[PDB]
Write an enzyme that holds these catalytic residues in place. Structure first.
Site, PDB file in Angstrom:
ATOM      1  N   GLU A 166       0.830  -1.227   0.000  1.00 22.94           N
ATOM      2  CA  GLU A 166       0.000   0.000   0.000  1.00 22.94           C
ATOM      3  C   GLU A 166       0.854   1.262   0.000  1.00 22.94           C
ATOM      4  OE1 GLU A 166      -2.640  -0.645   3.301  1.00 22.94           O
ATOM      5  OE2 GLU A 166      -4.058  -1.787   2.080  1.00 22.94           O
ATOM      6  N   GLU A 206      -5.923  -7.506  -0.548  1.00 25.94           N
ATOM      7  CA  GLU A 206      -6.258  -7.276   0.842  1.00 25.94           C
ATOM      8  C   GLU A 206      -7.668  -6.630   0.956  1.00 25.94           C
ATOM      9  OE1 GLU A 206      -3.013  -5.831   3.332  1.00 25.94           O
ATOM     10  OE2 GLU A 206      -4.617  -4.583   4.267  1.00 25.94           O
TER      11      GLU A 206
END
Ligand SMILES: [Mn+2]
EC number: 3.2.1.4
Length: 293
Positions: free
Chosen positions: A131, A219
């Site tokens: 991320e 995710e």
């Protein structure tokens, strides 16, 4: 199963059929790598029906940058996956280090070592930057990183899937889709939380696919974005229906007994699997039901 490849935006198996992988991610391996072993992965394969396991190797926060020996847990997980016949995502799990350029020299060395070890193993999928976040965008920051890392991996592994994170915690898949990498086996990560993210985020995904950018949800959580806040089953169903509708593979966050709603397990639950339904959290129960279908 075997070798994965990409037909347009669609992940396919070696037979050439569409495949939608489903599974669960470890929490950070420096804290919850104890839940990640051949026993627990086998139990997830057999009881939950997982077809992919994600090894979330944090770089920061006591992870690989400060203690690289956690890479031995990644290798343990990869060897377990090979023995069990499931896919394994090697996730260079940046987060506090929100620009992937911060730890790029170490990422390249890490991925050179993993591709060298597993460059003939069809089980392995590389996720090179979990991320990206902060003042970090595709053209300037994330794309040039991904090119260097992909170039390293490809020296050793010409065909396994590489998934590249996008801006705003792997939300800005539209920006990637406007400036795609040339690699034939690249996908872009999309992350969401059922309690936080809604139609605006699906529309970004829709825009990316319409441009030919493949998407993989490495995710997602049933919680809101903090990972706590309870479980949002309605919104989670709506999201999984949407992913099904586009045959998008997904990986739930997370397999641990951390005391927060997104954890699949209750404290005291075995590190080697074999869990009763009373060992699973409300999230864990739902996620398992949805992987089984
Ligand atoms: Mn390969």
């Amino acid at each position: 199963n075997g070798q994965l490849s990409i037909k347009g935006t669609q992940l396919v198996n070696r037979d050439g059929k569409a495949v939608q992988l489903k599974g669960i991610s470890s929490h950070g391996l420096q804290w919850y790598g104890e839940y990640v072993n051949k026993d627990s992965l086998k139990w997830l394969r057999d009881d939950w029906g997982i077809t992919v396991f994600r090894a979330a190797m944090y770089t920061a926060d006591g992870g690989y940058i400060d203690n690289p020996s956690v890479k031995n847990k990644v290798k343990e997980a990869v060897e377990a996956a090979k023995e069990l016949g499931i896919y394994v995502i090697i996730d260079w799990h940046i987060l506090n280090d929100g620009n992937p350029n911060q730890n790029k020299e170490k990422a390249k060395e890490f991925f050179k070592e993993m591709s060298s070890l597993y460059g003939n193993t069809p089980n392995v999928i590389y996720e090179i930057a979990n991320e990206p976040n902060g003042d970090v965008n595709w053209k300037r920051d994330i794309k040039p990183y991904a090119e260097e890392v992909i170039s390293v991996i490809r020296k050793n592994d010409p065909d396994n899937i590489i998934i590249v994170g996008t801006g705003t915690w792997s939300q800005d898949v539209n920006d990637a889709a406007d400036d795609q990498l040339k690699d034939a086996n690249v996908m872009y990560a999309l992350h969401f939380y059922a309690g936080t993210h809604g139609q605006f985020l699906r529309d970004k995904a829709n825009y990316a696919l319409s441009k030919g950018a493949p998407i993989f949800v490495t995710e997602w959580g049933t919680s809101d974005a903090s990972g706590n806040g309870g479980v949002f089953l309605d919104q989670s169903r709506e999201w999984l229906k949407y992913l099904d509708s586009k045959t998008i593979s997904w990986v739930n966050w997370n397999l641990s007994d951390k005391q927060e709603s997104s954890s699949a397990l209750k404290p005291g639950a075995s590190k080697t699997g074999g869990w009763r339904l009373s060992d699973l959290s409300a999230s864990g129960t739902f996620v398992r039901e949805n992987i089984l279908g």
